[PDB]
Amino acid sequence: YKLICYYTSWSQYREGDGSCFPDAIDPFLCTHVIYSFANISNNEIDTWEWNDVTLYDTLNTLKNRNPNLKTLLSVGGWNYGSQRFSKIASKTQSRRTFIKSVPPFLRTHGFDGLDLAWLWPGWRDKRHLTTLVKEMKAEFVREAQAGTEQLLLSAAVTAGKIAIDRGYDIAQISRHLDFISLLTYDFHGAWRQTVGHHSPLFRGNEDASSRFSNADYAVSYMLRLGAPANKLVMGIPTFGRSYTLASSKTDVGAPISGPGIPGRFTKWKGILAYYEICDFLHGATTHRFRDQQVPYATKGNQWVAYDDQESVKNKARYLKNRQLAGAMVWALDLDDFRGTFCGQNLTFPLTSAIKDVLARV
Ligand SMILES: *[C@@H]1O[C@H](CO)[C@@H](O)[C@H](O)[C@H]1NC(C)=O
Ligand SMILES: C[N+](C)(C)CCCC=O
């Protein structure tokens, strides 16, 4: 199985124990660690943080302890636009400049491959993403001739049917990519006016205003569109999403006034790290959505949809049953990477729960 795990550049700046550098990562926890995100500047891949060259080195030193570990660098992300990516991919000359720049930069910084994180191609972009993926893979095949193991190419792909149909020619890109990480954890957000889970495995009996908004639907769709099982990697979040409740109702359908208050460490309304959530659960009431097979918890006017050891194992059993290539984790710095928040003295509880299921029968 693969266990693809993202590390984010910006996690280093969090206050106190929220601070996460790549030497916090257990070299043997994942099979591939993806460093997020690289910029494109002068139409060439580039660093983002002032000290990315140092942290790339820190990450890459993990292979001293675990020489089988693979690393990739993800270009794109939310701060980088969609529109910035569109401009590069849609013109043959910009596209070539970009593609040429990638292998030398990766080899300089000790990465084994590139992850494409264009978030996200519009309907005018679908055909240009196809061309980008094909041409980038061709450049990697060419570069392998110089004697070093061929660079890997992956892509992060959103899990909503509408976004997939808008931007991605899944049958074509899957031919050239070594794996596709499906982002099966953005199925609900504060843009809705109610509580709901963003990473349910199934729809649940609840109701079907929108069937589609669940991981099973997305995995089945990707396979239907021609992504081989052996290239499809299912995303599992270590963060949860929070809401501020509008009423005392806490239940399926409960109204919401906006995202939840910011976490003490992650400081972003509407999201919490798992370590923050372990703290939140003290004094909270816990519930599971039985049909959707994922938990939520509530305290005061705050309501948090999240994943725990049981729901992540359950997702790992599911993707092994569908014979997928493995799991992707967003993100290592949002698991309890210190191991000191969740009452069990165990670093990366959620990621090691996934790893242990994948390792069994
Ligand atoms: C990314 O590249 C753009 C385009 O050159 C540049 O304007 C921007 O400052 C870069 N961002 C960072 C954080 O380096
Ligand atoms: C917004 N945070 C807290 C940086 C996390 C954003 C999703 C980050 O990984």
Side-chain angles (χ1 to χ4, degrees):
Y1 288 105
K2 288 179 174 64
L3 204 186
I4 304 310
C5 298
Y6 281 88
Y7 165 81
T8 57
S9 236
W10 60 98
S11 64
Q12 56 172 305
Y13 300 122
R14 296 180 181 134
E15 99 178 3
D17 282 349
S19 182
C20 187
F21 290 78
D23 57 335
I25 304 166
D26 169 1
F28 293 93
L29 179 51
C30 305
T31 62
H32 301 67
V33 171
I34 297 184
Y35 189 96
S36 279
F37 292 109
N39 199 11
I40 301 178
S41 182
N42 309 117
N43 295 337
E44 303 197 353
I45 188 164
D46 201 15
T47 61
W48 190 285
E49 308 294 351
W50 71 275
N51 57 350
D52 278 347
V53 301
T54 288
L55 296 216
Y56 294 166
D57 185 62
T58 303
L59 175 66
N60 290 126
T61 117
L62 304 174
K63 301 162 173 191
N64 292 355
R65 266 247 276 148
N66 179 8
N68 267 36
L69 180 59
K70 299 304 186 189
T71 53
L72 289 83
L73 178 61
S74 187
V75 214
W78 339 299
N79 293 341
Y80 194 88
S82 178
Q83 51 259 269
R84 282 183 63 204
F85 238 127
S86 177
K87 265 266 161 70
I88 283 135
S90 57
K91 277 180 189 89
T92 124
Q93 170 81 356
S94 276
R95 191 175 63 242
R96 191 257 357 263
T97 297
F98 171 60
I99 291 171
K100 265 280 178 227
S101 75
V102 163
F105 188 87
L106 300 182
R107 276 37 268 208
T108 295
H109 298 295
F111 292 102
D112 304 298
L114 184 77
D115 185 48
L116 297 162
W118 180 351
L119 312 178
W120 323 88
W123 61 267
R124 298 180 185 78
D125 297 308
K126 173 185 294 210
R127 171 238 333 175
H128 301 311
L129 184 277
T130 300
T131 300
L132 183 51
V133 160
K134 174 176 197 150
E135 292 183 345
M136 184 71 78
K137 176 65 162 264
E139 176 65 17
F140 290 6
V141 161
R142 204 135 47 232
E143 194 265 6
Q145 292 163 1
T148 75
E149 193 185 346
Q150 185 179 123
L151 287 158
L152 297 171
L153 184 64
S154 60
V157 175
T158 169
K161 194 188 179 288
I162 283 152
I164 289 165
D165 285 341
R166 185 211 302 127
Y168 297 89
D169 184 343
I170 296 305
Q172 277 316 310
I173 67 173
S174 297
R175 305 172 28 221
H176 300 297
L177 295 176
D178 295 302
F179 57 89
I180 282 157
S181 300
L182 226 188
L183 307 179
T184 28
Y185 51 59
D186 198 22
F187 291 119
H188 200 270
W191 55 84
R192 285 219 135 118
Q193 335 304 166
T194 60
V195 114
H197 213 292
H198 45 101
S199 65
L201 180 59
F202 299 110
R203 189 231 281 145
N205 325 278
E206 326 269 15
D207 12 303
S209 274
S210 318
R211 85 203 147 92
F212 290 158
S213 289
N214 57 85
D216 168 77
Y217 185 83
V219 163
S220 290
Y221 197 55
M222 294 279 300
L223 301 163
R224 197 328 45 169
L225 260 12
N230 69 5
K231 281 175 172 195
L232 212 206
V233 174
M234 194 169 76
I236 298 177
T238 181
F239 63 93
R241 301 189 84 142
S242 60
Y243 302 94
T244 294
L245 286 170
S247 85
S248 85
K249 191 177 178 301
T250 233
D251 185 40
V252 208
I256 250 62
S257 72
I261 61 160
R264 171 186 333 143
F265 301 97
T266 48
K267 308 179 159 102
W268 205 47
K269 63 208 189 312
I271 308 267
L272 302 171
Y274 189 59
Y275 57 91
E276 293 167 319
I277 296 169
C278 283
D279 199 49
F280 184 91
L281 265 353
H282 293 281
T285 317
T286 44
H287 299 291
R288 314 224 133 216
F289 293 122
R290 184 231 267 174
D291 34 19
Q292 311 165 65
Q293 300 185 170
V294 280
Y296 67 89
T298 190
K299 195 160 69 169
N301 70 357
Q302 294 305 110
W303 192 98
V304 175
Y306 65 109
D307 274 87
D308 60 7
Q309 301 163 128
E310 185 46 52
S311 71
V312 310
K313 293 194 283 147
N314 182 242
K315 289 169 179 179
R317 297 187 215 105
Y318 171 91
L319 68 85
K320 286 210 293 184
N321 285 332
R322 292 275 244 163
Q323 296 181 292
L324 300 190
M328 174 273 279
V329 176
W330 186 280
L332 290 169
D333 57 80
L334 305 169
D335 205 347
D336 178 19
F337 66 95
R338 273 168 203 277
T340 60
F341 289 71
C342 295
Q344 87 205 129
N345 226 64
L346 207 215
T347 188
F348 302 108
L350 291 190
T351 310
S352 245
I354 294 166
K355 174 180 169 32
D356 292 346
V357 170
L358 270 3
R360 227 89 67 238
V361 185

